[PDB]
Design a protein around this ligand. Sequence first.
Ligand SMILES: *[C@@H](O)[C@H](C[C@@H]1CCNC1=O)NC(=O)[C@H](CC1CCCCC1)NC(=O)OCC(C)(C)c1cccc(Cl)c1
Length: 170
Amino acid sequence: HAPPTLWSRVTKFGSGWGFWVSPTVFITTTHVVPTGVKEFFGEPLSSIAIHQAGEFTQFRFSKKMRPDLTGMVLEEGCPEGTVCSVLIKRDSGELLPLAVRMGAIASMRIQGRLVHGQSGMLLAKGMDLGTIPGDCGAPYVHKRGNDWVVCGVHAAATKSGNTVVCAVQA
Ligand SMILES: *[C@@H](O)[C@H](C[C@@H]1CCNC1=O)NC(=O)[C@H](CC1CCCCC1)NC(=O)OCC(C)(C)c1cccc(Cl)c1
């Protein structure tokens, strides 16, 4: 059960979403990142460290962008069998936390590209329980004791919607 403040980290970005890991660290899916710009959130690129690894993009800002937030655990995927929550925001404002049992980390063929990431099985289309275009960047999270953990960003899903894929950091 993700609390309000954790959902407040999910942020509209480009053609999808991203997620504030900390006041200065923002993660998203590479294919939703806007191209051609000279700023993100009003900050000049000169003021932003960009780390990209495949479909996982991480920004570190020099300015505290979300000073209301604490840091949190960011991990490179999760162990097979982990049930994560995908914190899907829709543009209507509706929240759709999607439970997903994560499979193996691998390099997957997706729309003709090789992508490092992690598949998962929803716990779909006909029951409108799945992901849809515009959801990319939404965080995959789980709680470990008193620690919230983010471990991927939404990147793709099957025709059925019963299988999703997150990008994971290198
Ligand atoms: C977010 O942009 C979107 C979310 C998807 C769309 C449909 N349902 C979702 O959850 N992601 C994509 O559309 C994704 C974009 C690629 C672009 C290049 C790099 C990797 C991501 N494509 C996608 O999900 O493909 C859908 C299929 C059916 C064509 C597909 C093919 C192969 C494997 C999979 Cl899992 C899906």
